[PDB]
Each structure stands twice: as structure tokens, then as C-alpha cells.
Amino acid sequence: ESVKEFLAKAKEDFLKKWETPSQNTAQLDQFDRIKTLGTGSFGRVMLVKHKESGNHYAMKILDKQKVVKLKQIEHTLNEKRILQAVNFPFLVKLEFSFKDNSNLYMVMEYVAGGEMFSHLRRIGRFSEPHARFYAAQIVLTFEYLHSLDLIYRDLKPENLLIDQQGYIQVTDFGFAKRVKGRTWTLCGTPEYLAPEIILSKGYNKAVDWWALGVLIYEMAAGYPPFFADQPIQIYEKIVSGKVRFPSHFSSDLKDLLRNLLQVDLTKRFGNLKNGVNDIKNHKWFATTDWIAIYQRKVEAPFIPKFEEEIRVSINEKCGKEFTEF
Amino acid sequence: TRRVSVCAETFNPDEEEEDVVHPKTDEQRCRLQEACKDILLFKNLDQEQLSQVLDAMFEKIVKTDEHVIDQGDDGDNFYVIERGTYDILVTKDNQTRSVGQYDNRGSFGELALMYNTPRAATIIATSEGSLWGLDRVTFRRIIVKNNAKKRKMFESFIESVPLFKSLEMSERMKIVDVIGEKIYKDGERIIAQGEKADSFYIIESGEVSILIRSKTKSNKNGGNQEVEIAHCHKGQYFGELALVTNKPRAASAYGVGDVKCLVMDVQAFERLLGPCMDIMKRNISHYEEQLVKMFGSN
């Protein structure tokens, strides 16, 4: 089928960019500067416009020196290599990358839309059809990523954006990692952690599917399946695998979720013989047109609503290590 | 409220190259084990890892009036009480409540073993006491290292099994993820002739004797005793037929000395990799060979 075609052509396109990262592409003098929405509690993200084309992009300001501290400096040098090598419709884009004494500036695409977390929390919960709509997009995105042996590891409403077309756009590859075999960092979000992560048994693609189960549950319920006031209790619930579904959850949904939230890896959807098709062919996704969702031809159920002046050092610093970029 | 991500310190799982000594009496260690039974991170750890972990636990002496942990402070260790009394306090908004006490028993701060996060309560000693402590980094490294070593070892025993040679790397790892281990003392029965064949074994140590009571050979009667058909050793496997058929076990299997086997459920195996017959055919130039091995003479 074309699925194989697409993925094959996909791996090709990816391995090429992966084994030859596109370093320092565009020049900072081609982009101006507008607002400056990028504070929070880390990093400096400011809006910006383009010259000739005159487009809008989101530039992440990462002071070459600012690094070295914090928690890590590879979970980034690696993050950059991935964003640049990947290409999918429901994935944010690394448009332009560059550095020099400033060093390591990320020119991400910009969608003047709304956050998934804000939307979900306001209305409480999505109808199953609407939830299925967003879910399909994440299934497809994970199939693509896993095709490239890349695991996301941080699925959650907070990391999902709703673009002006009403489709999902995934952001923040802080924990994204290419792994063929097994990996071990205990990372992600409490509510969304897999039993194997919590217990350090080693893991790979299966955690993303577990997270999806959590993500789908929360969308249709309004709250995550293993919620609790204390982190410890959340994990003990996660490890026990016992889940209680709201009254309004349909049968097909409950079944799909029992298969995604499987503590037993021999029974978890996505991890079995057929992989992602066990999910794509599930009765809950029967009314889903996978190609349609991919081409973004389906009508989304919700269209969202729509400082300072830093300078270089006139000299390149930490460039004696951030070479690869 | 937006939930923030958490992350522990990274570490090269694959053993760098052999390169924590805190004395403990039998009673002390035995008491530490008891205190740890229910802690989820410890709850289902194997014998070895638990030992290495207790080995790594350092002692911390505390004088009365001293703060073991203070609410809000960053956490790095988990503590088990050895001696002493302690008062537990929890501040909610502007109020601080002396909520509970510990009297020479207890543990707290388990969360610190996962990632760095603020201490949720304050613990103060009310007498001279002693606590056993464990640093996150030390704890995570002991565990990951050991599980990554176990994985490599499981991987090898699956890889050397010819029946699984056509398996891809990722397919062997799915097995490694779920496969079990069992220890058998010399002479104890592992497989009983007649019961249902649900799994297969791969000997990783010791030997196994396969016996058959020669009666199921005719029409009613005979031998009705004990005959050894085969005798397997380290690296070999038995019970393979459960992977390709659904008839009661043909013969019984007993441990010849101390034995350690990897045990894999057939149904789980199929759900993960599909039926074994297809795997055997994957490499067509060895299909016949494989067939003769499974249903052949010897």
C-alpha cells in the first residue's frame, strides 16, 4: 500500500537529513522582530517576521553560554538534529537554524492558534467523535515517528497546539530521542508515565502508545485515568493498571482504552504483532478516514481564536563544542 | 493547571567498566528489607538488586532537634529509620501542623528516588537517632545497570536458539521485555507429562532430564515406569512443541541439579510475534531443517 511507500520515502528523506544535519541555514539579518512572547520559566522565545517573503516565525533564543548548566545540553543539541531531519503535517517545523557567538537560534514555524490544554479545560471534555478526530492525528504522527525509530515521550494536552485549520500541531521535542533497542531516562509528565518508565525496566516505542491511551482518556473524560493529589499515588495507580471509566464512555472506547493502558506489554496495542494497525482497525476508529485526516481534508470540530533588544558578543564563545548545529 | 514535565539525570545504561561500602549487620539488613517490602520501587526488585541497593545505603546519625528534611527543600535521598523518634510537620498555606510522629520505625521521601522535587513535609528528630539513606543517582544507576545487564544476557540466550535466528533485533527485545525466569532445585519437576503446554523453556544454567512413561505407546498397557528421552544443558531449550501444537505434554521434565530457565508463554509469544510456524519459514533455505528439528527423530 502507499503506507509502505510513504514510510519508505520517509525513512530515506530522514536518514539523509539525519546523517548530514542542515547547520546554520539562514541569516539573522533576514528576519526582523515583533512581539516577545517567550518567558514562562525558561528560554527566550520571541516572534519575528521575514524579509523577502515576509512570513511569521517563532524564534527560540538559546544563548550558547546559557547552556552548560541547567539539566542537560545534549537533550537539545539532539533535539535540534531531530526537528531538522523530520517532516510531518502534524509536527511543528524547524524553519531556519543558525548560530555564532549569539549562537543557537531556532526559527520554528508559527501558527496563530490555540492551546489544546486551554481548550480542553474550558469545555471540560470533548465528545467522542471530536476526541477521535484529534486521536487519529496522534496515531498517524506516532506511526511516522516510530518508522524513524524516534520516540516522543512527552505526550500531553500541554504539548499540543490547535492550528487555525483546527488540526493538531505537536510541539516541544525536549524528550524526543532516536532509539533502536532500549532506552532508560525517567522522563515525561507524571500523569502520562508508563509503568516501565517508573520502574526502570528499559523501554522504547511502547510508552508513546500508553501515553496515547492516557491522552484519549483525558480528552473524553476531562481528567487523566490515574489522577491523584500526590505523585506517589499516581504512580502506584499507574503500576496497578486498574482503571475506572466514566459512565458515559462507549463500549468501543473502553475496549480500545483497556488495550492501550495495558501494563502487560504482551497485550498492549501498538506493541503487538500488527503494531499500529491494531489501533487503526479498532472498532472505535471505524468511522475514521485515515487518508483524509492525513491530508487535513476532514472538517475539524473547533477553529481556535486568532520586550527588549538583545545583541551578540561580537565574538563566538561556546562554539568550541556546539560545532554540530 | 498545566502539568510540568519531570526528568531524572541521564546515564549510560550499558556498563561502563567496573570502576559504595557501608557496613550492616544481619539484623539491620533484615530490618531494612522489611521496611522496604511495600515501597513500589523496591516491591518487585529481584534478590540481587535489592542486595546491591541495601549495600549502597549509607548511615546518617541525627542528634535530637535536628531537621532530617525541611518542606520545600530539594530532595535527593530516601530514608529508613534505624533508631530514634521524629515529629512530622506539614505546612499548608500559612498553617503548620504537627501531624504525626515516628517511633523507631518508618521511611519517607521515596519520591526523591525518581526525580528531583520539593520535599512535601518537614521531619525533625526528637532524640538521638539513626537513619539509613539512599541517594537517587546511586539507586537509579544500580537498577538500570543491572536491568541492562540482564537484558543483554536474555538477548544472548534467545539469539543462540536457532529456532529464533530469523527474528529481527526488535523482535528479540519484545521477548526480552516480558520473558520470565525461574529457579529449580535439583530433582524438582518443571514440566509434567499430560498437563497443558503453555510455555517453553531455555536453560541458562544446570541440566534438565526429560522423562516419558512408556504407556502411550500401543493400545492400553506396558512400561508404566520412567524413561529418559533427552537431557538438556546450558543454552538448550525444551517444551518447544507448545509453540507449534496444542496437545498435552508428551513427557515430564525434571531439574538435574540447580536450574535456572527462561520461561516464555506461548500465547504471549504469538500476540507479540505471530505464530512460530511463520517465523520458521521466514528463511526458506532452512525451513526443512527447522521442520525436521521440531517434528523429527532425535
Coordinates of C-alpha atoms in Angstrom, one line a residue:
Chain A
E1 CA 0.0 0.0 0.0
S2 CA 1.0 3.7 -0.2
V3 CA 1.6 3.4 3.6
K4 CA 4.7 1.5 2.9
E5 CA 5.6 3.9 0.0
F6 CA 5.2 6.9 2.2
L7 CA 7.3 5.5 5.1
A8 CA 10.0 4.2 2.8
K9 CA 10.3 7.5 1.1
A10 CA 10.0 9.0 4.6
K11 CA 12.9 7.0 6.1
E12 CA 15.0 7.9 3.0
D13 CA 14.3 11.6 3.4
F14 CA 15.0 11.3 7.2
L15 CA 18.2 9.3 7.1
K16 CA 19.6 11.7 4.6
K17 CA 19.0 14.8 6.8
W18 CA 19.8 12.8 10.0
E19 CA 23.3 11.8 8.8
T20 CA 24.0 15.3 7.5
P21 CA 22.2 17.9 9.7
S22 CA 21.4 21.2 8.0
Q23 CA 23.5 23.5 10.1
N24 CA 23.4 27.3 10.3
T25 CA 20.9 27.8 7.4
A26 CA 19.5 31.4 7.3
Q27 CA 21.0 34.7 8.4
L28 CA 19.7 36.8 11.3
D29 CA 19.5 39.9 9.2
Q30 CA 16.8 38.4 7.0
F31 CA 14.4 38.4 10.0
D32 CA 13.3 41.5 12.0
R33 CA 11.5 41.2 15.3
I34 CA 7.9 41.9 16.6
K35 CA 6.4 40.9 19.9
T36 CA 8.3 38.9 22.6
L37 CA 6.1 36.0 24.0
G38 CA 8.7 33.5 25.3
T39 CA 9.2 33.9 29.0
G40 CA 7.5 31.5 31.5
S41 CA 10.3 29.9 33.4
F42 CA 12.9 29.1 30.8
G43 CA 14.2 30.1 27.3
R44 CA 13.6 33.3 25.4
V45 CA 11.1 32.9 22.5
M46 CA 10.2 36.0 20.5
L47 CA 8.0 36.5 17.4
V48 CA 9.6 37.6 14.2
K49 CA 8.9 38.5 10.6
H50 CA 10.7 37.7 7.3
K51 CA 12.2 40.0 4.7
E52 CA 11.6 39.0 1.0
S53 CA 8.8 36.5 1.8
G54 CA 7.7 38.4 4.9
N55 CA 6.5 35.5 6.9
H56 CA 5.9 35.0 10.6
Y57 CA 8.0 32.6 12.6
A58 CA 8.8 31.7 16.3
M59 CA 12.5 32.1 17.1
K60 CA 13.8 30.4 20.2
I61 CA 16.7 32.3 21.7
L62 CA 19.3 30.0 23.3
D63 CA 22.4 31.8 24.5
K64 CA 25.3 29.5 23.6
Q65 CA 26.6 30.2 27.1
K66 CA 23.3 29.9 28.9
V67 CA 23.7 26.2 28.2
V68 CA 26.2 24.0 30.1
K69 CA 24.1 24.4 33.3
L70 CA 20.6 23.6 33.7
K71 CA 19.8 19.9 33.3
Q72 CA 21.5 19.0 30.1
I73 CA 23.0 20.4 26.9
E74 CA 22.5 17.3 24.7
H75 CA 18.8 16.9 25.1
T76 CA 18.9 20.0 22.9
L77 CA 21.8 19.5 20.5
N78 CA 20.0 16.3 19.8
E79 CA 16.5 17.9 19.8
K80 CA 17.8 20.2 17.0
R81 CA 19.1 17.3 14.9
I82 CA 15.7 15.7 15.0
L83 CA 13.4 18.7 14.3
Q84 CA 15.6 19.3 11.3
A85 CA 15.5 15.8 10.0
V86 CA 11.8 15.2 10.4
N87 CA 8.8 16.1 8.2
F88 CA 5.1 15.5 9.1
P89 CA 1.9 17.6 8.8
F90 CA 1.0 17.4 12.5
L91 CA 4.5 18.2 13.6
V92 CA 5.9 21.7 14.2
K93 CA 8.7 22.8 11.9
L94 CA 12.3 23.9 12.3
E95 CA 12.3 26.5 9.5
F96 CA 15.7 28.1 10.0
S97 CA 18.6 27.3 12.3
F98 CA 21.7 29.4 12.9
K99 CA 24.4 30.4 15.5
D100 CA 27.6 32.4 16.0
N101 CA 28.7 34.0 19.4
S102 CA 24.9 34.5 19.8
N103 CA 24.6 31.0 18.9
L104 CA 21.6 28.7 18.5
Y105 CA 18.7 30.3 17.4
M106 CA 15.7 28.2 16.4
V107 CA 13.3 29.6 13.7
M108 CA 10.2 27.5 14.3
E109 CA 7.1 27.8 12.2
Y110 CA 4.3 29.8 13.7
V111 CA 0.6 29.0 13.9
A112 CA -1.6 31.8 15.4
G113 CA -3.9 29.3 17.1
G114 CA -4.9 28.0 20.5
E115 CA -3.5 25.6 23.1
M116 CA -5.0 22.1 23.5
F117 CA -4.8 22.3 27.3
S118 CA -6.8 25.6 27.5
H119 CA -9.5 24.4 25.1
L120 CA -10.0 21.0 26.8
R121 CA -10.1 22.5 30.3
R122 CA -12.6 25.2 29.4
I123 CA -15.2 22.9 27.8
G124 CA -14.4 20.1 30.3
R125 CA -14.3 17.3 27.8
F126 CA -14.6 16.5 24.1
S127 CA -17.3 14.4 22.6
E128 CA -16.0 11.0 21.5
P129 CA -16.2 11.9 17.8
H130 CA -14.2 15.1 18.4
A131 CA -11.7 13.1 20.6
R132 CA -11.4 10.5 17.9
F133 CA -10.5 13.3 15.4
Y134 CA -7.5 14.5 17.4
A135 CA -6.5 10.9 18.4
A136 CA -6.2 9.9 14.7
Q137 CA -3.8 12.7 14.2
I138 CA -1.6 11.5 17.0
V139 CA -1.7 7.8 15.9
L140 CA -0.5 8.8 12.4
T141 CA 2.2 11.0 13.9
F142 CA 3.5 8.2 16.1
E143 CA 3.5 5.7 13.2
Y144 CA 5.6 8.2 11.3
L145 CA 8.0 8.8 14.2
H146 CA 8.3 5.2 15.1
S147 CA 9.0 4.4 11.5
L148 CA 12.1 6.5 12.1
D149 CA 12.9 4.9 15.4
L150 CA 12.1 8.1 17.3
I151 CA 10.1 8.2 20.5
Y152 CA 8.3 11.4 21.6
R153 CA 8.0 10.7 25.3
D154 CA 6.1 13.7 26.4
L155 CA 2.6 13.4 25.0
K156 CA 0.1 15.6 26.8
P157 CA -2.6 18.4 26.2
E158 CA 0.1 20.9 27.2
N159 CA 2.3 19.9 24.3
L160 CA -0.4 20.1 21.6
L161 CA -1.4 23.1 19.6
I162 CA -4.6 23.6 17.6
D163 CA -3.8 25.5 14.4
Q164 CA -6.0 27.9 12.5
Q165 CA -7.2 24.9 10.4
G166 CA -8.3 23.2 13.6
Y167 CA -5.8 20.4 13.3
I168 CA -3.2 19.4 15.8
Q169 CA 0.4 20.5 15.7
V170 CA 2.8 18.8 18.1
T171 CA 5.4 20.9 19.9
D172 CA 8.4 20.5 22.3
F173 CA 10.8 17.7 21.4
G174 CA 12.6 18.1 24.7
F175 CA 12.5 14.3 25.3
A176 CA 12.4 13.1 21.7
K177 CA 15.1 10.5 21.1
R178 CA 16.1 8.1 18.3
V179 CA 16.3 4.7 19.8
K180 CA 16.7 1.3 18.2
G181 CA 16.9 -1.1 21.1
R182 CA 16.1 0.2 24.6
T183 CA 16.5 3.4 26.5
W184 CA 16.3 4.4 30.1
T185 CA 15.8 8.1 31.1
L186 CA 13.0 8.5 33.6
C187 CA 11.2 11.5 31.9
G188 CA 7.8 12.7 30.7
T189 CA 4.9 14.0 32.8
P190 CA 3.7 12.3 36.0
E191 CA 0.2 11.7 34.8
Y192 CA 1.4 10.2 31.5
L193 CA 4.3 8.0 32.6
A194 CA 4.4 4.3 31.6
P195 CA 4.8 1.6 34.2
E196 CA 8.1 0.5 32.6
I197 CA 9.5 4.1 32.9
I198 CA 8.5 4.4 36.5
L199 CA 10.2 1.1 37.3
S200 CA 13.3 1.4 35.1
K201 CA 12.8 -1.8 33.1
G202 CA 14.0 -0.3 29.9
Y203 CA 11.7 0.8 27.1
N204 CA 11.1 2.1 23.6
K205 CA 8.1 2.7 21.4
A206 CA 5.5 1.2 23.7
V207 CA 5.5 4.2 26.1
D208 CA 4.1 6.5 23.4
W209 CA 1.1 4.2 22.9
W210 CA 0.5 4.1 26.6
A211 CA 0.6 7.9 26.7
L212 CA -1.9 8.0 23.9
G213 CA -4.3 5.9 26.0
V214 CA -3.9 8.4 28.8
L215 CA -4.4 11.3 26.3
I216 CA -7.5 9.8 24.8
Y217 CA -9.0 9.0 28.2
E218 CA -8.5 12.6 29.4
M219 CA -10.0 14.1 26.3
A220 CA -13.2 12.1 26.7
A221 CA -13.4 12.3 30.4
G222 CA -11.8 15.7 31.2
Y223 CA -9.3 14.2 33.6
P224 CA -6.5 11.6 33.4
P225 CA -7.1 7.9 34.3
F226 CA -4.6 7.7 37.1
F227 CA -5.1 11.1 38.8
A228 CA -4.3 11.8 42.4
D229 CA -3.1 14.7 44.6
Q230 CA 0.2 13.0 45.5
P231 CA 2.7 12.0 42.7
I232 CA 3.4 8.8 44.7
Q233 CA -0.2 7.6 44.5
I234 CA -0.4 8.4 40.8
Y235 CA 2.5 6.0 40.2
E236 CA 1.1 3.3 42.4
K237 CA -2.1 3.5 40.4
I238 CA -0.2 3.5 37.1
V239 CA 1.7 0.4 38.2
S240 CA -1.5 -1.4 39.3
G241 CA -3.0 -0.7 35.9
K242 CA -6.5 -0.7 37.4
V243 CA -8.8 1.9 35.6
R244 CA -12.3 3.1 36.2
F245 CA -14.2 4.5 33.2
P246 CA -16.9 7.2 33.4
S247 CA -20.5 6.0 32.9
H248 CA -20.8 7.9 29.5
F249 CA -17.8 6.1 27.9
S250 CA -19.0 3.9 25.0
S251 CA -18.1 0.3 24.7
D252 CA -15.7 0.6 21.8
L253 CA -13.9 3.3 23.7
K254 CA -13.5 1.3 26.9
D255 CA -12.2 -1.6 24.9
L256 CA -9.7 0.5 23.0
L257 CA -8.5 2.1 26.2
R258 CA -8.1 -1.2 28.1
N259 CA -5.8 -2.2 25.3
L260 CA -3.8 1.0 25.3
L261 CA -3.5 1.2 29.1
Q262 CA -2.1 -2.4 29.3
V263 CA 0.6 -2.8 32.0
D264 CA 1.3 -6.1 30.3
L265 CA 3.5 -5.5 27.2
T266 CA 2.4 -8.7 25.7
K267 CA -1.2 -7.3 25.4
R268 CA -0.6 -3.6 24.7
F269 CA -1.9 -2.2 21.4
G270 CA 0.9 -0.9 19.1
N271 CA 3.4 -3.3 20.7
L272 CA 1.9 -6.4 19.3
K273 CA 2.4 -8.3 16.0
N274 CA 0.4 -5.8 13.9
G275 CA 1.7 -2.7 15.6
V276 CA -0.2 0.4 14.8
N277 CA -2.9 -1.4 12.8
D278 CA -4.3 -3.0 16.0
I279 CA -5.2 0.6 16.8
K280 CA -6.2 1.8 13.3
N281 CA -8.5 -1.1 12.8
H282 CA -10.2 -0.9 16.2
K283 CA -14.0 -0.5 16.2
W284 CA -13.6 2.9 17.9
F285 CA -11.8 4.2 14.8
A286 CA -14.1 2.6 12.2
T287 CA -15.6 5.9 11.1
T288 CA -12.1 7.3 10.6
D289 CA -10.8 8.1 7.2
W290 CA -7.0 8.0 7.8
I291 CA -6.0 9.4 4.5
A292 CA -8.5 12.2 4.9
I293 CA -7.1 13.1 8.3
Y294 CA -3.6 13.0 6.8
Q295 CA -4.4 15.4 4.0
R296 CA -6.2 17.5 6.5
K297 CA -9.4 17.4 4.4
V298 CA -11.7 16.5 7.3
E299 CA -13.6 19.4 9.0
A300 CA -12.2 20.0 12.4
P301 CA -14.8 20.5 15.2
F302 CA -13.2 23.6 16.5
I303 CA -11.4 26.6 14.9
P304 CA -9.4 28.4 17.6
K305 CA -9.2 32.2 18.2
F306 CA -6.9 34.2 16.0
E307 CA 10.1 43.1 25.3
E308 CA 13.7 44.1 24.8
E309 CA 16.6 44.2 22.2
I310 CA 19.4 41.7 22.8
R311 CA 22.7 41.6 20.9
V312 CA 25.7 39.3 20.1
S313 CA 29.1 39.4 21.7
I314 CA 30.9 40.4 18.5
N315 CA 32.8 37.2 19.3
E316 CA 31.9 33.5 19.1
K317 CA 32.1 31.7 22.5
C318 CA 30.9 28.2 23.3
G319 CA 31.4 27.4 19.6
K320 CA 34.2 25.1 20.6
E321 CA 31.7 22.4 21.3
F322 CA 28.3 23.4 19.7
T323 CA 30.1 22.9 16.4
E324 CA 27.4 20.4 15.3
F325 CA 24.4 22.6 14.8
Chain B
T1 CA -3.2 23.6 36.0
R2 CA -0.6 23.0 33.3
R3 CA 1.4 19.9 34.4
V4 CA 5.2 20.3 34.0
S5 CA 7.5 17.6 32.8
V6 CA 9.9 15.8 35.1
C7 CA 13.2 14.3 34.2
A8 CA 15.8 12.3 36.1
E9 CA 19.6 12.5 35.5
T10 CA 20.6 10.6 32.4
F11 CA 23.1 7.8 32.5
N12 CA 24.8 5.4 30.0
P13 CA 22.9 2.2 30.9
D14 CA 25.4 -0.1 29.1
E15 CA 28.0 -1.0 31.8
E16 CA 30.9 1.5 31.5
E17 CA 33.6 -0.9 33.1
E18 CA 33.5 -2.0 36.8
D19 CA 35.2 1.1 38.4
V20 CA 29.8 2.2 47.9
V21 CA 30.8 0.4 51.1
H22 CA 28.5 0.8 54.1
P23 CA 28.7 -2.0 56.8
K24 CA 25.5 -3.6 58.1
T25 CA 24.7 -6.5 60.4
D26 CA 22.3 -9.3 59.6
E27 CA 19.6 -7.8 61.9
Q28 CA 20.0 -4.3 60.4
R29 CA 19.8 -5.5 56.8
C30 CA 17.0 -7.9 57.6
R31 CA 15.1 -4.9 59.1
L32 CA 15.8 -2.8 56.1
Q33 CA 14.3 -5.4 53.8
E34 CA 11.2 -5.5 56.0
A35 CA 10.9 -1.7 55.9
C36 CA 11.1 -1.8 52.1
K37 CA 8.6 -4.6 51.2
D38 CA 5.8 -2.3 50.3
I39 CA 7.7 0.6 48.6
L40 CA 6.7 0.4 44.9
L41 CA 10.2 0.9 43.6
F42 CA 11.5 -1.8 45.8
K43 CA 8.4 -4.0 46.0
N44 CA 9.2 -6.2 42.9
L45 CA 13.0 -6.0 42.6
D46 CA 14.9 -9.3 42.3
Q47 CA 17.1 -10.7 45.1
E48 CA 20.4 -9.3 43.7
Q49 CA 19.3 -5.7 43.0
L50 CA 17.8 -5.5 46.5
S51 CA 21.1 -6.6 48.0
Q52 CA 23.1 -4.1 45.9
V53 CA 20.7 -1.4 46.9
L54 CA 20.9 -2.1 50.6
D55 CA 24.6 -2.3 50.3
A56 CA 24.5 1.2 48.9
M57 CA 22.5 2.6 51.8
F58 CA 24.7 4.9 53.9
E59 CA 24.1 5.6 57.6
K60 CA 23.1 9.1 58.8
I61 CA 23.3 9.8 62.5
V62 CA 21.0 12.5 63.8
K63 CA 21.0 14.5 67.1
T64 CA 17.8 15.5 68.8
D65 CA 16.2 18.7 67.4
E66 CA 17.8 18.2 64.0
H67 CA 15.8 18.6 60.8
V68 CA 16.1 15.5 58.6
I69 CA 14.2 17.1 55.8
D70 CA 12.5 20.5 55.5
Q71 CA 9.4 21.1 53.5
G72 CA 10.1 22.8 50.2
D73 CA 13.8 21.8 50.1
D74 CA 15.1 19.8 47.1
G75 CA 15.2 16.1 47.7
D76 CA 17.9 13.6 46.8
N77 CA 17.6 10.9 49.4
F78 CA 15.1 8.3 50.7
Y79 CA 15.4 7.4 54.4
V80 CA 14.7 4.4 56.6
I81 CA 14.6 4.9 60.3
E82 CA 17.1 2.9 62.3
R83 CA 16.7 4.5 65.8
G84 CA 15.0 7.5 67.3
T85 CA 11.8 9.4 67.5
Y86 CA 10.7 12.1 65.0
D87 CA 7.9 14.6 64.5
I88 CA 6.3 15.1 61.1
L89 CA 5.1 18.5 60.1
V90 CA 3.1 19.8 57.2
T91 CA 2.6 23.5 56.3
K92 CA -0.5 24.2 54.3
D93 CA -0.7 27.9 53.3
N94 CA 0.1 29.8 56.4
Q95 CA -0.5 27.0 58.8
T96 CA 1.9 24.4 60.1
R97 CA 0.5 21.2 61.7
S98 CA 2.5 18.7 63.8
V99 CA 0.6 15.9 62.0
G100 CA 2.3 12.7 63.2
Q101 CA 5.3 11.1 64.8
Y102 CA 7.7 8.1 64.1
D103 CA 9.0 6.0 66.9
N104 CA 12.0 4.0 65.7
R105 CA 10.1 2.8 62.7
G106 CA 9.4 4.4 59.3
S107 CA 10.6 5.6 56.0
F108 CA 9.9 8.7 53.8
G109 CA 11.0 10.6 50.7
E110 CA 10.5 7.8 48.3
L111 CA 9.7 10.3 45.5
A112 CA 13.2 11.6 45.7
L113 CA 14.4 8.3 44.1
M114 CA 12.6 9.1 40.9
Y115 CA 13.5 12.8 40.2
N116 CA 14.3 16.0 42.0
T117 CA 11.2 17.5 43.5
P118 CA 10.4 19.7 46.6
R119 CA 10.1 18.0 50.0
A120 CA 6.4 17.9 50.9
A121 CA 6.8 17.8 54.7
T122 CA 9.4 18.5 57.4
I123 CA 10.8 15.8 59.7
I124 CA 12.5 16.7 62.9
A125 CA 14.3 14.3 65.3
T126 CA 13.2 14.4 68.9
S127 CA 16.1 12.2 70.2
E128 CA 19.4 10.8 69.1
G129 CA 18.6 8.6 66.2
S130 CA 20.0 6.8 63.1
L131 CA 18.6 6.7 59.6
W132 CA 19.6 4.7 56.5
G133 CA 19.8 6.9 53.5
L134 CA 19.8 6.3 49.7
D135 CA 20.7 8.8 47.1
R136 CA 18.6 8.8 43.9
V137 CA 21.6 8.7 41.5
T138 CA 23.1 5.8 43.3
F139 CA 19.8 4.0 43.3
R140 CA 18.9 4.6 39.7
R141 CA 22.4 3.6 38.4
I142 CA 22.3 0.3 40.4
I143 CA 19.0 -0.7 38.9
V144 CA 19.4 0.4 35.3
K145 CA 22.8 -1.1 35.1
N146 CA 21.5 -4.4 36.4
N147 CA 18.4 -4.5 34.2
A148 CA 20.5 -3.5 31.2
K149 CA 22.9 -6.4 32.0
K150 CA 20.0 -8.8 32.4
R151 CA 18.6 -7.7 29.1
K152 CA 21.9 -8.3 27.3
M153 CA 22.1 -11.7 28.9
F154 CA 18.5 -12.6 28.0
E155 CA 19.1 -11.4 24.5
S156 CA 22.1 -13.8 24.1
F157 CA 20.1 -16.9 25.2
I158 CA 17.4 -16.1 22.7
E159 CA 19.9 -15.3 19.9
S160 CA 21.8 -18.6 20.3
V161 CA 18.5 -20.5 19.9
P162 CA 18.4 -21.5 16.2
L163 CA 14.6 -21.5 16.1
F164 CA 14.7 -17.8 16.6
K165 CA 17.5 -16.9 14.2
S166 CA 15.2 -15.4 11.7
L167 CA 13.9 -13.0 14.4
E168 CA 14.8 -9.3 14.0
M169 CA 16.6 -7.4 16.8
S170 CA 13.5 -5.6 17.8
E171 CA 11.5 -8.8 17.9
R172 CA 14.0 -10.4 20.3
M173 CA 13.7 -7.4 22.5
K174 CA 10.0 -7.7 22.8
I175 CA 10.6 -11.2 24.1
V176 CA 13.3 -9.9 26.5
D177 CA 10.8 -7.3 27.8
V178 CA 8.3 -9.9 29.0
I179 CA 10.1 -13.2 29.4
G180 CA 10.3 -14.8 32.8
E181 CA 12.9 -16.6 35.0
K182 CA 12.6 -19.5 37.4
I183 CA 14.9 -21.3 39.7
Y184 CA 14.5 -25.0 40.3
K185 CA 16.2 -27.1 43.0
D186 CA 17.7 -30.4 41.9
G187 CA 15.1 -33.1 41.3
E188 CA 12.0 -30.9 41.2
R189 CA 9.6 -31.2 38.3
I190 CA 9.5 -28.4 35.8
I191 CA 7.1 -29.9 33.2
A192 CA 4.6 -32.7 33.9
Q193 CA 3.6 -35.2 31.2
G194 CA -0.1 -34.8 30.5
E195 CA -0.7 -31.2 31.6
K196 CA -1.3 -28.4 29.0
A197 CA 1.7 -27.0 27.1
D198 CA 1.5 -23.2 27.7
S199 CA 5.2 -22.2 27.5
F200 CA 8.7 -23.2 26.6
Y201 CA 12.0 -23.0 28.4
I202 CA 15.6 -22.0 27.7
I203 CA 18.2 -23.4 30.2
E204 CA 20.6 -20.7 31.3
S205 CA 22.3 -22.9 33.9
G206 CA 22.2 -26.5 35.1
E207 CA 20.7 -29.5 33.4
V208 CA 17.2 -30.9 32.8
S209 CA 16.1 -34.6 32.4
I210 CA 13.2 -35.3 30.1
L211 CA 11.4 -38.5 31.0
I212 CA 8.4 -40.3 29.5
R213 CA 6.3 -43.1 31.0
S214 CA 6.2 -45.6 28.1
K215 CA 2.4 -46.5 28.1
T216 CA 1.2 -44.0 25.5
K217 CA 2.9 -46.5 23.0
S218 CA 0.3 -49.0 21.6
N219 CA -3.2 -49.8 22.8
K220 CA -3.6 -50.0 26.7
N221 CA -0.6 -51.1 29.0
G222 CA 3.1 -51.5 29.4
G223 CA 6.4 -49.9 30.8
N224 CA 4.4 -47.6 33.2
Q225 CA 7.7 -46.5 34.8
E226 CA 10.3 -43.9 33.8
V227 CA 12.5 -43.4 30.7
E228 CA 14.8 -40.5 29.8
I229 CA 14.3 -39.4 26.2
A230 CA 16.6 -36.4 26.3
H231 CA 19.0 -34.5 28.6
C232 CA 19.4 -30.7 28.1
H233 CA 22.1 -28.3 29.3
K234 CA 23.0 -24.6 29.4
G235 CA 21.7 -22.9 26.3
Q236 CA 19.3 -25.6 25.3
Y237 CA 15.5 -25.4 25.3
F238 CA 12.6 -27.7 25.9
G239 CA 8.8 -27.6 25.6
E240 CA 9.2 -26.2 22.1
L241 CA 6.3 -28.2 20.8
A242 CA 3.9 -25.9 22.7
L243 CA 4.8 -23.3 20.1
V244 CA 3.6 -25.5 17.2
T245 CA 0.9 -27.7 18.5
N246 CA -1.9 -28.0 21.1
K247 CA -1.7 -31.5 22.6
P248 CA -0.9 -32.4 26.2
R249 CA 2.8 -32.6 27.2
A250 CA 4.3 -35.7 25.8
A251 CA 6.8 -36.1 28.6
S252 CA 7.8 -34.7 32.0
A253 CA 10.9 -32.6 32.7
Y254 CA 12.9 -32.6 36.0
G255 CA 15.7 -30.4 37.2
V256 CA 19.1 -32.2 37.2
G257 CA 20.8 -30.2 40.0
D258 CA 20.2 -26.5 40.5
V259 CA 18.5 -25.0 37.4
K260 CA 17.7 -21.6 36.0
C261 CA 15.4 -21.3 33.0
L262 CA 13.9 -18.5 30.9
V263 CA 10.2 -19.2 30.7
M264 CA 8.1 -17.8 27.8
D265 CA 4.4 -18.1 27.5
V266 CA 3.3 -19.3 24.1
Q267 CA 0.2 -17.1 23.8
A268 CA 2.2 -14.0 24.7
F269 CA 4.8 -15.0 22.1
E270 CA 2.1 -15.3 19.4
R271 CA 0.4 -12.0 20.3
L272 CA 3.8 -10.4 20.0
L273 CA 5.4 -12.1 17.0
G274 CA 2.6 -14.1 15.5
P275 CA 2.7 -18.0 15.2
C276 CA 6.0 -19.7 15.4
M277 CA 5.5 -21.7 12.2
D278 CA 5.7 -18.5 10.1
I279 CA 8.9 -17.5 11.8
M280 CA 10.4 -20.9 11.0
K281 CA 9.6 -20.4 7.3
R282 CA 10.9 -16.8 7.1
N283 CA 14.2 -18.2 6.0
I284 CA 13.1 -20.7 3.4
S285 CA 16.5 -22.4 2.9
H286 CA 16.4 -23.6 6.5
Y287 CA 12.7 -24.3 6.6
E288 CA 13.1 -28.1 6.1
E289 CA 16.0 -28.2 8.6
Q290 CA 13.8 -26.5 11.2
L291 CA 10.9 -28.8 10.5
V292 CA 13.0 -31.9 11.0
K293 CA 14.3 -30.4 14.2
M294 CA 10.8 -29.8 15.6
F295 CA 9.0 -33.0 14.5
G296 CA 12.0 -35.2 13.8
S297 CA 13.6 -38.3 15.3
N298 CA 16.2 -37.1 17.7

